[PDB]
Amino acid sequence: QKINPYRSHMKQKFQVLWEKEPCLLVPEDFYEETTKIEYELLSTVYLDASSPTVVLHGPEGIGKTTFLRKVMLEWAKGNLWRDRFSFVFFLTGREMNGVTDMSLVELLSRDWPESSEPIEDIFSQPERILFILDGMEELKFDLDCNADLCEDWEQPQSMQVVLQSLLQKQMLPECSLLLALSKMGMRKNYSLLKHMKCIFLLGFSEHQRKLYFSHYFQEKDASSRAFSFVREKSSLFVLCQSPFLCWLVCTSLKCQLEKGEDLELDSETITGLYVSFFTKVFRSGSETCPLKQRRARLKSLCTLAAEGMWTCTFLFCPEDLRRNGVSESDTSMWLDMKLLHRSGDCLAFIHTCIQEFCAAMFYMFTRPKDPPHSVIGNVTQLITRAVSGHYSRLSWTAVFLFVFSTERMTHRLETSFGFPLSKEIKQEITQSLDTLSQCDPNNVMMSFQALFNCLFETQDPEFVAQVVNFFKDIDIYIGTKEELIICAACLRHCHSLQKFHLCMEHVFPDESGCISNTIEKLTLWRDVCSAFAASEDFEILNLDNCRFDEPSLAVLCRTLSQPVCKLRKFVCNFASNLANSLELFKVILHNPHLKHLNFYGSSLSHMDARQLCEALKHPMCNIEELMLGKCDITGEACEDIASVLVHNKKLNLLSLCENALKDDGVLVLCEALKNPDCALEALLLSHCCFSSAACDHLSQVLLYNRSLTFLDLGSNVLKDEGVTTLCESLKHPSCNLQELWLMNCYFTSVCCVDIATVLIHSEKLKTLKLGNNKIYDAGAKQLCKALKHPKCKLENLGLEACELSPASCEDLASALTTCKSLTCVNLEWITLDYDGAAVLCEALVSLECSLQLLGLNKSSYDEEIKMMLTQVEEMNPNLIISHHLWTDDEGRRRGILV
Numbered sequence: 001q002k003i004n005p006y007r008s009h010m011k012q013k014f015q016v017l018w019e020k021e022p023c024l025l026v027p028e029d030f031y032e033e034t035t036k037i038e039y040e041l042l043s044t045v046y047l048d049a050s051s052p053t054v055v056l057h058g059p060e061g062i063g064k065t066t067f068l069r070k071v072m073l074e075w076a077k078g079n080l081w082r083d084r085f086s087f088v089f090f091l092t093g094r095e096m097n098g099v100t101d102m103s104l105v106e107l108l109s110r111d112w113p114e115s116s117e118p119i120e121d122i123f124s125q126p127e128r129i130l131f132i133l134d135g136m137e138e139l140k141f142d143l144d145c146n147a148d149l150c151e152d153w154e155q156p157q158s159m160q161v162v163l164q165s166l167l168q169k170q171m172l173p174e175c176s177l178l179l180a181l182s183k184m185g186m187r188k189n190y191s192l193l194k195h196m197k198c199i200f201l202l203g204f205s206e207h208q209r210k211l212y213f214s215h216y217f218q219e220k221d222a223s224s225r226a227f228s229f230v231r232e233k234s235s236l237f238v239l240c241q242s243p244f245l246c247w248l249v250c251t252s253l254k255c256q257l258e259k260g261e262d263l264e265l266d267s268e269t270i271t272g273l274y275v276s277f278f279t280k281v282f283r284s285g286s287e288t289c290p291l292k293q294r295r296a297r298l299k300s301l302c303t304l305a306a307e308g309m310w311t312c313t314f315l316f317c318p319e320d321l322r323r324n325g326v327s328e329s330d331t332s333m334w335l336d337m338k339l340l341h342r343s344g345d346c347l348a349f350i351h352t353c354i355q356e357f358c359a360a361m362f363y364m365f366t367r368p369k370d371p372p373h374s375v376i377g378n379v380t381q382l383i384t385r386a387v388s389g390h391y392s393r394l395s396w397t398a399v400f401l402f403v404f405s406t407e408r409m410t411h412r413l414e415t416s417f418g419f420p421l422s423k424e425i426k427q428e429i430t431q432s433l434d435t436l437s438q439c440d441p442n443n444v445m446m447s448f449q450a451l452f453n454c455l456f457e458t459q460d461p462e463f464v465a466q467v468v469n470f471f472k473d474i475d476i477y478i479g480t481k482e483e484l485i486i487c488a489a490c491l492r493h494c495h496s497l498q499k500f501h502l503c504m505e506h507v508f509p510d511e512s513g514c515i516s517n518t519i520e521k522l523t524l525w526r527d528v529c530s531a532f533a534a535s536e537d538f539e540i541l542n543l544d545n546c547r548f549d550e551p552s553l554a555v556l557c558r559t560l561s562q563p564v565c566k567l568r569k570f571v572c573n574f575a576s577n578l579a580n581s582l583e584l585f586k587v588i589l590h591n592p593h594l595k596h597l598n599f600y601g602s603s604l605s606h607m608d609a610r611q612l613c614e615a616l617k618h619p620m621c622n623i624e625e626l627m628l629g630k631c632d633i634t635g636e637a638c639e640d641i642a643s644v645l646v647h648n649k650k651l652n653l654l655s656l657c658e659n660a661l662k663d664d665g666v667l668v669l670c671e672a673l674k675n676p677d678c679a680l681e682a683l684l685l686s687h688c689c690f691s692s693a694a695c696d697h698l699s700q701v702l703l704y705n706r707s708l709t710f711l712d713l714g715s716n717v718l719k720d721e722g723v724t725t726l727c728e729s730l731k732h733p734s735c736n737l738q739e740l741w742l743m744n745c746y747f748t749s750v751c752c753v754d755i756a757t758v759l760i761h762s763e764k765l766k767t768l769k770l771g772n773n774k775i776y777d778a779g780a781k782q783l784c785k786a787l788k789h790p791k792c793k794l795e796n797l798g799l800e801a802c803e804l805s806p807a808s809c810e811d812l813a814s815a816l817t818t819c820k821s822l823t824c825v826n827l828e829w830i831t832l833d834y835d836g837a838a839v840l841c842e843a844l845v846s847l848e849c850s851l852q853l854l855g856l857n858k859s860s861y862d863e864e865i866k867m868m869l870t871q872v873e874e875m876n877p878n879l880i881i882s883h884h885l886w887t888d889d890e891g892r893r894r895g896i897l898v
């Protein structure tokens with residue numbers, strides 16, 4: 001083998017570490033038998049020579065860290081990737097947390113012996129390097145790609161930006177990465193990961209569990225007794241799959257055997273298993289200690305764990321132990337009872353999960369007399385940080401805290417420990433959850449998955465109901481059967497839901513078609529759907545990228561079609577199939593309260609459109625607003641859609657944005673609208689890829705429709721002939737058009753005079769949005785003169801990003817002080833100088849101005865103009881300056897957002 005001293009140093013160091021870090025020294029043969037499949041998969045996936053990045057997937061406690069340590073140790077002895085990988089660097093979140101500002105070169109050199117190859121020399125061939133990011137969920141900073149990404153390793157940079165660049169492969173694209181994340185980590189980082197590869201850890205099996213039990217128990221008879229005892233219990237045996245939970249069960253059984261009491265264990269939930277483990281180890285490890293001193297020791301350990309969790313520190317220096325109140329004898333006591341262990345020259349908890357367990361246990365010792373710790377947050381802060389999706393770093397703690405809220409669990413804790421515990425934790429949690437429920441959902445971005453997990457783990461149906469009924473808008477993603485059962489347990493007895501957003505995949509039968517699972521799955525789905533019909537406030541239902549089958553969707557339609565339900569808005573994204581279409585037709589036919597449909601993103605064909613139009617032809621339909629944005633509808637399919645407008649007189653809003661009609665759908669719609677019988681009032685055709693050829697036909701609509709009022713034809717190549725034809729059509733007062741949206745129509749200022757005519761002649765046009773068009777100072781001048789003409793009944797005018805000039809300001813200055821009916825003007829992205837800004841501000845200050853809303857970006861100006869704008873805002877409380885005034889409103893009206 002090639003001579004290498006970094007490899008030898010890593011081999012020695014992690015060979016030493018492998019015999020102390022794990023809870024028990026598992027035999028090497030048995031361990032490699034347990035995880036042989038994943039080892040082979042990794043060996044096959046890294047023998048292929050941007051290298052793809054593979055991430056280990058699984059819940060906490062399966063052994064991802066141990067697996068990574070074993071793999072890289074085997075590499076260190078050279079039995080793996082001998083001719084593939086030359087240098088492998090192990091990076092853990094806990095050791096990088098203490099780093100404030102340091103370059104990657106120094107980070108790699110901190111453990112790289114000097115008497116070796118230079119770092120630049122080893123980096124000259126970055127195709128042979130592997131960066132194993134282990135336990136990145138223990139980091140103090142979350143990953144959101146907000147920060148800038150760097151490409152140079154030599155230059156000092158912060159840890160967050162370096163990690164982001166390495167993850168996104170903009171820094172050393174040819175390097176290989178090995179990751180280990182949980183389910184929540186995958187959910188948070190799915191967007192960030194590219195070329196992602198998935199490897200799943202399976203844990204222990206039947207024979208593996210038996211062998212591990214026999215290895216843990218050096219004896220035979222009681223070992224077989226314990227194995228049988230865990231065998232008769234289905235839930236305990238299922239939870240025994242995780243090696244850490246298996247070790248917890250083994251040590252709890254050992255404590256029970258050494259105590260002499262009969263084998264008893266509460267295995268309803270994982271948290272119950274943790275509580276039993278802690279109770280029995282505490283009872284077995286303290287027998288000659290007074291209960292006052294026992295309580296003091298437990299409180300000191302709990303405060304230490306809570307401080308470690310809140311400060312994101314997992315290596316405890318003896319100074320920290322002295323500060324928190326831990327003595328040498330107490331340290332020896334916990335080392336003997338196997339709750340802490342040496343990680344070199346410092347101490348660390350036996351496992352991170354036990355660490356947040358003790359951190360949550362700390363909150364049971366609340367003392368009103370004691371002042372706030374100023375470092376550890378209160379219950380409300382912990383709940384907010386755990387249930388919110390921004391950080392989601394102390395979720396597990398909250399979970400344990402939730403289990404501590406139940407009367408039975410706290411009674412068991414008080415009985416076992418012997419000293420009373422705080423009983424206001426449940427009330428405080430309820431108040432905090434109510435407070436966050438009262439907050440607007442947009443500014444909080446609450447992660448309902450963590451809250452639902454806590455509610456499922458607490459097993460308090462009345463408390464679950466009280467918590468769930470606080471929230472009105474529920475967003476949920478269901479990708480696993482465990483997620484499905486958790487959601488069913490949370491929403492079985494919900495009767496306050498009003499807005500539901502569901503992203504549900506990979507759950508209903510696609511593999512393993514056994515008789516069991518699936519029938520129960522359907523029952524779970526029926527229990528979930530029961531919330532739709534059990535609450536008389538259900539308004540909006542949004543199925544985003546959902547994957548249904550025939551029986552599940554049939555059950556959902558049966559639930560929604562009941563007359564007791566009052567669903568109003570149905571937003572179905574990326575879901576339209578033959579069975580899906582038929583079931584949606586059943587929903588539309590049987591529901592009289594349904595009025596708003598948004599099929600944005602759902603790909604449709606000619607047959608699908610024909611079936612939908614045939615269903616809409618039914619006279620029982622009470623549908624009013626219909627949006628089919630980005631449905632890939634062509635002109636011929638519009639032939640069916642037009643037929644709907646022939647019969648459906650209740651419909652009054654139609655949006656067909658982001659289509660490819662190419663004047664054919666426009667011609668068909670105009671021909672349908674020729675009949676003076678349609679009650680359509682709003683039509684949106686943005687980005688329909690249609691030209692001015694059909695615009696003349698649209699002209700014939702404006703002279704024949706007395707009901708159509710709102711027309712949006714934006715983001716279409718209309719040039720000047722189209723807009724001139726539209727103006728000629730709108731010259732006649734007989735037109736009933738009220739609002740016109742012609743942004744990004746690619747017209748110039750020469751045709752603006754025609755617009756300058758219609759603003760004088762049209763007495764019914766209230767809103768005109770001509771933004772994002774190259775109309776220069778000249779066209780601005782004719783528009784301003786048209787407003788100056790004192791017969792213009794125009795209210796809203798949007799000329800954003802029109803490439804205006806400061807010379808136009810004077811023309812604007814006269815307009816705002818002359819047009820009395822002008823209320824809102826959006827003139828964003830205008831270049832202003834001192835002279836133009838001064839006259840504009842004077843015009844705004846002048847009392848003759850009737851403007852109420854001004855769309856302009858104040859931040860994009862120099863100090864003088866910004867100061868003048870602030871002054872004019874101060875002197876005019878009745879005028880509001882804003883940016884992005886109509887973007888969200890336009891998106892909502894077109895259905896792009898929802």
Ligand SMILES: Nc1ncnc2c1ncn2[C@@H]1O[C@H](COP(=O)(O)OP(=O)(O)O)[C@@H](O)[C@H]1O
Binds near residue numbers: 067
């Ligand atoms: N195959 C196995 N045999 C014996 N013990 C295991 C095995 N896999 C994991 N463990 C134990 O489970 C614990 C898992 O901890 P860790 O390696 O940090 O992974 P995780 O982060 O998933 O908990 C380790 O302390 C280890 O002792």
